[PDB]
Design a protein around this ligand. Structure first.
Ligand SMILES: Cn1nc(C(=O)NCC(F)(F)c2ccccn2)c2ccccc21
Ligand SMILES: [Zn+2]
Length: 140
């Protein structure tokens, strides 16, 4: 589990969105596994605006932050899970690292701020949903 809290937005994995998220919806994209809901309180996370390919992610199944090298956001065939069929997930970045399904929502960050959230993994890979192109997270 886990979210990004930027301004009056909450950024979660679409597959982990709550009823309250859906009832307060700003934007959702199944192909990206992203959903954004509105919040009453202002958040403290800042979004990175950059093409960093190194950073650090949180792994809940190890209670550890790991430094990683990751690919640029791409279209990647990801295997079926209990939440999606085997499909092309867009704006996805891959790294070598430990993940389990419940690690979804852990933050990936670089020197500039938050880069994305855990979305996929297995066999010593972890996939992150990028948010650096969502410039509207920084306004209104
Ligand atoms: C970090 N992590 N996430 C998953 C996972 O099932 N992801 C859920 C999901 F986003 F809906 C998904 C994404 C893409 C395709 C199908 N389902 C996983 C599985 C094994 C080991 C690590 C893992
Ligand atoms: Zn950066």
């Amino acid at each position: 589990s886990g979210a990004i809290y930027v301004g009056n937005y909450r950024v979660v994995n679409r597959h982990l969105a709550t009823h309250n998220d859906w009832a307060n919806l700003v934007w959702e994209d199944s192909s990206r596994d992203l959903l954004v809901s509105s919040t009453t309180a202002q958040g403290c996370d800042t979004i990175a605006r950059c093409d960093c390919q190194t950073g650090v992610y949180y792994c809940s199944s190890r209670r550890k932050h790991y430094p990683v090298s990751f690919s640029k956001p791409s279209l990647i065939f990801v295997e079926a899970s209990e939440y999606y069929p085997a499909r092309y997930q867009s704006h996805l970045m891959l790294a070598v690292g430990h993940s389990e399904p419940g690690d979804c929502g852990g933050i990936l960050r670089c020197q500039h701020g938050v880069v994305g959230i855990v979305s996929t993994g297995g066999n010593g890979l972890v996939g992150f949903a990028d948010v650096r192109d969502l410039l509207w997270l920084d306004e209104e």
